[PDB]
Amino acid sequence: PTIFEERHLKYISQLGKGNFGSVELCRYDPLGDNTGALVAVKQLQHSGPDQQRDFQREIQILKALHSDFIVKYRGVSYGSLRLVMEYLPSGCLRDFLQRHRARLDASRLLLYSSQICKGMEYLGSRRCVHRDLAARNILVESEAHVKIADFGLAKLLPLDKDYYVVQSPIFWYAPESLSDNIFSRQSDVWSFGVVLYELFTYCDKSCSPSAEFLRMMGSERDVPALSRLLELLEEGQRLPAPPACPAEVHELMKLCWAPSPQDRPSFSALGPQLDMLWS
Ligand SMILES: C[C@@H](NC(=O)c1c[nH]c2ncc(-c3nn(C)c4cc(F)ccc34)nc12)C(=O)N1CC(C#N)C1
Numbered sequence: 001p002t003i004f005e006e007r008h009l010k011y012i013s014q015l016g017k018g019n020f021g022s023v024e025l026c027r028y029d030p031l032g033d034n035t036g037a038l039v040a041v042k043q044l045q046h047s048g049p050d051q052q053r054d055f056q057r058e059i060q061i062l063k064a065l066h067s068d069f070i071v072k073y074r075g076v077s078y079g080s081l082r083l084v085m086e087y088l089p090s091g092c093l094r095d096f097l098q099r100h101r102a103r104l105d106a107s108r109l110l111l112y113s114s115q116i117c118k119g120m121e122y123l124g125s126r127r128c129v130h131r132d133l134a135a136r137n138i139l140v141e142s143e144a145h146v147k148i149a150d151f152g153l154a155k156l157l158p159l160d161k162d163y164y165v166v167q168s169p170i171f172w173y174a175p176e177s178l179s180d181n182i183f184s185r186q187s188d189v190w191s192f193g194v195v196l197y198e199l200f201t202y203c204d205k206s207c208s209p210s211a212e213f214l215r216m217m218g219s220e221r222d223v224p225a226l227s228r229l230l231e232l233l234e235e236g237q238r239l240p241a242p243p244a245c246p247a248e249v250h251e252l253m254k255l256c257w258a259p260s261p262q263d264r265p266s267f268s269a270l271g272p273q274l275d276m277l278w279s
Pocket residue numbers: 015016017018019020021022023040042043071085086087088089090091092095136137138139149150152
């Protein structure tokens with residue numbers, strides 16, 4: 001049931017690509033008659049020992065997570081460890097928002113925000129820091145239902161600590177991650193703020209997190225991009241209000257980007273502030 005035999009995975013195509021892996025559309029087809037279910041299967045690429053041990057942790061985390069707003073674990077395949085997950089054909093929210101922009105109103109973006117916030121509230125209850133929350137890592141189950149995916153960089157908080165010192169794009173990172181490699185549930189709140197930005201810009205590439213920040217951080221100097229972003233964030237620079245973003249939603253974004261981790265709201269606090277907008 002939870003064990004998928006390698007030789008019955010029929011490879012269709014590649015869904016998405018990570019730094020140390022890919023997610024492939026496969027049909028698990030034991031009967032050989034093409035009646036089997038389509039599934040999304042992660043395998044490692046360009047992998048050394050460190051990424052292998054990370055993958056073993058990631059499988060166990062995903063396996064232990066049970067939420068309507070978190071992508072479902074199906075099983076694993078050995079032979080060559082592979083992680084089998086539910087296939088959501090509508091794909092990722094990043095592509096979905098660009099594709100269906102003309103039909104997706106503010107109220108629907110708020111639905112997605114609220115569901116992501118719930119998933120993130122659930123993650124915090126399991127003491128799990130996602131570390132790579134972004135629109136590219138949210139999947140569409142239906143028009144009115146999204147789920148958090150990609151637990152490849154996810155860390156369980158130690159039982160006696162609410163932070164972890166430990167690479168995704170720097171433009172979703174909290175200042176304390178940028179500066180001291182510190183990650184926490186409130187580091188995820190910083191990222192969620194950027195996700196809210198993505199939603200309300202419909203993931204338009206002309207005003208993406210990187211496009212906005214890259215423009216702020218000058219042409220070039222003998223200074224790395226990381227230091228210059230940290231400098232701007234310490235000067236109080238933030239992503240702007242998206243075109244036609246509701247005032248109140250932009251204000252929630254700014255609360256997610258409070259300099260101090262303890263001054264950012266909890267997902268539990270954010271949830272009702274998202275749901276009660278416009279009611
Ligand atoms: C975001 C993650 N996707 C998953 O974990 C998925 C689990 N079930 C899925 N069902 C569908 C998809 C997916 N479909 N389509 C059309 C996509 C297009 C994309 F750009 C990304 C993901 C998908 N991804 C998934 C992914 O693509 N990667 C993690 C990295 C690794 N390894 C690459």
